[PDB]
From a paper:
Contractile bacteriophages of the family Myoviridae (i.e. T4), R-type pyocins and the type VI secretion system (T6SS) of Gram-negative bacteria are evolutionarily related nano-scale injection machines that puncture target cell membranes using a shared contraction mechanism. [name] subunits are enigmatic as they possess a conserved N-terminal region of unknown function, previously identified as ImpA_N (PFAM: PF0681226), whereas sequences located C-terminal to this region are highly divergent. Consistent with this, phylogenetic analysis has suggested that the [name] family can be subdivided into three clades (TssA1, TssA2 and TssA3). The structural studies presented here show that TssA1B, TssA2A and TssA2B possess structurally diverse CTDs that lead to distinct overall architectures for their respective complexes.
Nested deletion of consecutive helical segments of TssA1B CTD revealed that loss of α15 resulted in the failure of the protein to assemble into a high molecular weight ring, and structure determination of the construct H12–H14 (helices α12–α14) and of that consisting of α12 and α13 alone (residues 303–347), revealed them both to be dimers. In the assembled Bc TssA1B CTD ring, analysis by PISA32 revealed an extensive dimer interface (~950 Å2) between monomers in the different layers, which principally involves the interaction of residues located in helices α12–α13 with their two-fold related subunits forming a region of hydrophobic packing with hydrophilic interactions at the periphery.
Residue numbers in the entry:
A (entry chain A): 303 to 347
B (entry chain B): 302 to 347
Write the structure that this text describes.
């Protein structure tokens, strides 16, 4: 991974994969929530 | 692309390392790390 944009693309791909294969799992939830937050960089946490 | 579950976990781990290194205090670093940990747990019929 060379930069943030590539890292976000890879994270989104992984979230999609776990949603498809393990849809109601805690792993699918956490991966998806990580992708969500990657698109909200200005949200204070 | 991702060909199987092992590869998905491996990619998740690489993403978690990238964010740990570049944005250690962000929600993305924290969540990607937890997701990666949880991906190593035994499977269940969720």
């Amino acid at each position: 991974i060379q930069n943030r944009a590539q890292a976000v693309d890879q994270l989104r791909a992984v979230a999609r994969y776990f949603r498809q294969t393990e849809p109601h799992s805690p792993v699918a939830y956490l991966a998806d929530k990580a992708a969500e937050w990657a698109d909200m960089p200005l949200h204070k946490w």
